[PDB]
Amino acid sequence: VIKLHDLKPAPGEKKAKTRVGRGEGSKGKTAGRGTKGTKARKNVPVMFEGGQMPIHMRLPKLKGFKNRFRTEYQVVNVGDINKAFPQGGTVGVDELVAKGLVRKNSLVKVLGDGKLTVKVDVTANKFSGSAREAITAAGGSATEL
Amino acid sequence: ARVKRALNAQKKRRTVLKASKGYRGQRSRLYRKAKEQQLHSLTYAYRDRRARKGEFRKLWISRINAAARANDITYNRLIQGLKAAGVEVDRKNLAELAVSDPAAFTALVDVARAALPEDVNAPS
Amino acid sequence: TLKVDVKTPAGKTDGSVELPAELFDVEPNIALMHQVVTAQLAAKRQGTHSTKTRGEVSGGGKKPYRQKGTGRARQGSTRAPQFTGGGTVHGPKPRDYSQRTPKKMIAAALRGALSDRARNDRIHAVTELVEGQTPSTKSAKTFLGTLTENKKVLVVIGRTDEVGAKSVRNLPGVHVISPDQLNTYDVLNADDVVFSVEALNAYISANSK
Amino acid sequence: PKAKTHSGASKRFRRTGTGKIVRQKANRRHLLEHKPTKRTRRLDGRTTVSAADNSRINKLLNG
RNA sequence: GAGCCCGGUACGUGAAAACCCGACGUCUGUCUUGAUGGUGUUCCCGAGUAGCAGCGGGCCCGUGGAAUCUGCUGUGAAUCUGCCGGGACCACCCGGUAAGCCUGAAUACUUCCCAGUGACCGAUAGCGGAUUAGUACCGUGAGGGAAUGGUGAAAAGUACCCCGGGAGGGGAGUGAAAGAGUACCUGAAACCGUGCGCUUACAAUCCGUCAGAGCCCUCGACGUGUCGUGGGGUGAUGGCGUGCCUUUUGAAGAAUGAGCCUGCGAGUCAGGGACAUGUCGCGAGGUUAACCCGGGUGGGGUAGCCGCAGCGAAAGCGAGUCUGAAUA
RNA sequence: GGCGUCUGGGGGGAACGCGGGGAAGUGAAACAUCUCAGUACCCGUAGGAAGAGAAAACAAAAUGUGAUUCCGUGAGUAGUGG
């Protein structure tokens, strides 16, 4: 029978806070800050280098743009298909997300990484070159939406 | 959870003040000035405990050399004899024999004289 | 599966219940129970405590005297932290202490707390505390004494059960709680658990599905 | 409050597959008639940032 | 230190009158001198408005390729194959029908009133204000702006006598206590005395420290006083000995600060923030936010976020990808 | 314009609303663009709440949403910036 006084935190969980500026025995009179200067009083900003042109301002900006209309697919490898469906059967997008292979609302593309040995009729929005072969050569059909 | 620092702080004030009794002037009444003394007082002691060993060894040499010269032998020769003779009484008891019971010390001196070389300045 | 013998106020056994091995046989996890019961206490603690900083004290908006020449310390206000009556520099502010504990952690704490009671034979089930439609704590006290002799006890009573709840309210150590509102801290605080047959089934049916 | 990613560092550095930090080289914008092709050829492409400034850069990009 | 002594609590009961919410009617207005579905043309659909131009404002957008919204000055159209939006613009398609007006609920707040709560303060705290409080006081004025809580269960607050002009005190009384006497709970430290023990008027002293004669007190055993695995207080005399903190290459420093005591006075909090490191849950999965249901800390909540494939400026390709004429 | 007569205003209020006017210290390790900030303050106004509101709206080829307001996400991202 356990009561509220038998409950102890796991060893190593709770660690005592290091009080600072509380006597010269532990951390005294300077609190780890050393003597006078800028860093003694307040702080120094991260992006500041003493006047010299910072590393983030003397390097050319990265090239290109983003193409807001980029269509980014969710990829599942044929190797994962084999593991999740040993028997085979039909596997649409809903069947994949039921096994947690791809995100629920994404645009699935099937990529041919692993080895497929099962009769499976996949259905995904796109297929890589090797995914077509792996599906077909293993006696399966790959119909895309 | 506001905490009044009376109980926690008064503890160390009693220790220093009680331990600084017998001091002259302010060094016996005020905690600030008494603590300044306790820093010196406990530094002087730790230095004097080490120096006491050297001081007391000294007083013994002065008593040995005084009695050794009363028996017509210098101290440095008396020690050279005793070390050679196989007597390993330290200086504390040698000074004790010299003061309390002089009869034994004369016996010790005669032992030291015998074990000394024939010509102490020989290059041996 | 633990068979809990059901009792009645007349002293006649009615039937038995089968505590599932999932809910009532988990190995207790002390480090997990401690985190949970600390989380509920922190949510209980209300952070109503505040002090006025140097900025929120009434007045002290003028440099009391000159910078130079006076011969006293340089002072910038009559309410600075070092003054008497000045502001509080690092004081308490009203804050909330509730912390987000995952659902799986919280539930598993309750199962461990309940499983502990079942092992040591502390879980009791009762059809009804007293004769219907008439509260009477003398009858309830006699019943509870018959069941368990320990000082503290926890009674899980269905929401709609009022004659039972209003009967055992006045008792010194008895705490009454709805089967939906079951929590770790209450369970651990009790020597026994006196379930209600309608409540025990409701609790079991809620999780086991 | 959230932590605002530094605008300048976000537009100059990149994260690769393993978590490396890459950057582009300087001296390639103008005044490069007299710069021989060997100089320009060695001055293009992304380079892993030096471990000297890898500490500061991670602070800028992540916060 | 009260469930059973009192006020109350659980649980019930109570409105003459006023006010507020409803509800049923008098009363008010409207439809019935009216509706339903069909065919081919002319009229209408908000004007100094829309649009354009100059100068501005504001939108992620600092005039930029600068759309939509809007102010001032000019110029100034159409009424449905009309007009405006779909980030200059043009064509096609799609949406809508400006230059007329009302609209509750979801939402923000608390001068005030009622009932509560506190791992909030407890008289230098908490409101500036537990007491004459925005009072006293300072300033012509705007304005600034304090300090002061506690006898006792009950006042039973010392009748009476003595010294004294009185104050104050001593007897005697009340009181459990007067080491509670309206200067009143507890009553510390600085500071000020009184009595006793030791020491000090030939002596150079960061005022101590280590030895240490003498005197005084104490605890034992043994006789008159004399030792001891003793304890205390003083210390004649000898040896050694340059304050504390800051800040400095370096300070006892004739560099800075502190007259003393007691109170008070400085790495804290918020955020699903960032990085790192422990511990716990689940584990190719983890988790909810807002919100809803519970007098609770519990239950629900899949919208999102992180992981799960990378390369490339991007189209794209994908265990590969980019560069490249190239398996270079 | 003058008369006579009826009804109204005027001032106060702690916070919250709406429409106007609108700084500086500060950050930029200087500084003018920029930030602080449409913040402090000022003006005119109500209400128990106010403002907004019934598409000359989003959207992107889906036979989609369907007034406004207020929370959570989107996101410290797309962008913007001596």
UniProtKB/Swiss-Prot annotation, chain B:
GO cellular component terms given for this protein: ribonucleoprotein complex; ribosome
Classification via InterPro entries: Ribosomal_bL20, RIBOSOMAL_L20_CS, Ribosomal_protein_bL20_C
UniProt-listed Pfam families: Ribosomal_L20
Keywords from the UniProt entry: Ribonucleoprotein, Ribosomal protein, RNA-binding, rRNA-binding
GO biological process, one term: ribosomal large subunit assembly
Keyword field contains Ribonucleoprotein: yes
Domain of life: Bacteria
PROSITE patterns cross-referenced by the UniProt entry: RIBOSOMAL_L20 (PS00937)
One MF term in the entry's GO annotations: rRNA binding
CDD domains associated with the record: Ribosomal_L20
UniProt similarity note: Belongs to the bacterial ribosomal protein bL20 family.
PANTHER family (alphabetical): 39S RIBOSOMAL PROTEIN L20
Function: Binds directly to 23S ribosomal RNA and is necessary for the in vitro assembly process of the 50S ribosomal subunit. It is not involved in the protein synthesizing functions of that subunit.
NCBIfam families per record: rplT_bact
Record protein name field: Large ribosomal subunit protein bL20
Organism per entry: Mycolicibacterium smegmatis (strain ATCC 700084 / mc(2)155) (Mycobacterium smegmatis)
Swiss-Prot record, chain C:
Gene Ontology process terms (BP): translation
SUPFAM superfamilies: Ribosomal protein L4
Record-linked Gene3D superfamilies: 3.40.1370.10
Cellular component annotations (GO), alphabetically ordered: ribonucleoprotein complex; ribosome
Gene Ontology MF, one: structural constituent of ribosome
Keyword annotations from UniProtKB, A to Z: Ribonucleoprotein, Ribosomal protein, RNA-binding, rRNA-binding
InterPro entries according to UniProt: Ribosomal_uL4 (IPR002136), Ribosomal_uL4-like (IPR013005), Ribosomal_uL4_dom_sf (IPR023574)
Region (Disordered): 42-99
Stored HAMAP family: Ribosomal_uL4_B
Function (record text): One of the primary rRNA binding proteins, this protein initially binds near the 5'-end of the 23S rRNA. It is important during the early stages of 50S assembly. It makes multiple contacts with different domains of the 23S rRNA in the assembled 50S subunit and ribosome.
PANTHER family associated with the record: 50S RIBOSOMAL PROTEIN L4, LARGE RIBOSOMAL SUBUNIT PROTEIN UL4M
Complex and partners: Part of the 50S ribosomal subunit.
Family (UniProt): Belongs to the universal ribosomal protein uL4 family.
Name under which the protein is recorded: Large ribosomal subunit protein uL4
Organism encoding this protein: Mycolicibacterium smegmatis (strain ATCC 700084 / mc(2)155)
Taxonomic classification: Bacteria, Bacillati, Actinomycetota, Actinomycetes, Mycobacteriales
Gene that this polypeptide is encoded by: rplD
UniProtKB/Swiss-Prot annotation, chain D:
InterPro entries: Ribosomal_bL35, Ribosomal_bL35-like, Ribosomal_bL35_CS, Ribosomal_bL35_sf
Record region (Disordered): 1-63
PROSITE patterns: RIBOSOMAL_L35
Keywords: Ribonucleoprotein, Ribosomal protein
GO CC annotations, alphabetized: cytosolic large ribosomal subunit
Keyword Magnesium assigned: no
GO molecular function: structural constituent of ribosome
The name this protein goes by in its record: Large ribosomal subunit protein bL35
Organism: Mycolicibacterium smegmatis (strain ATCC 700084 / mc(2)155)
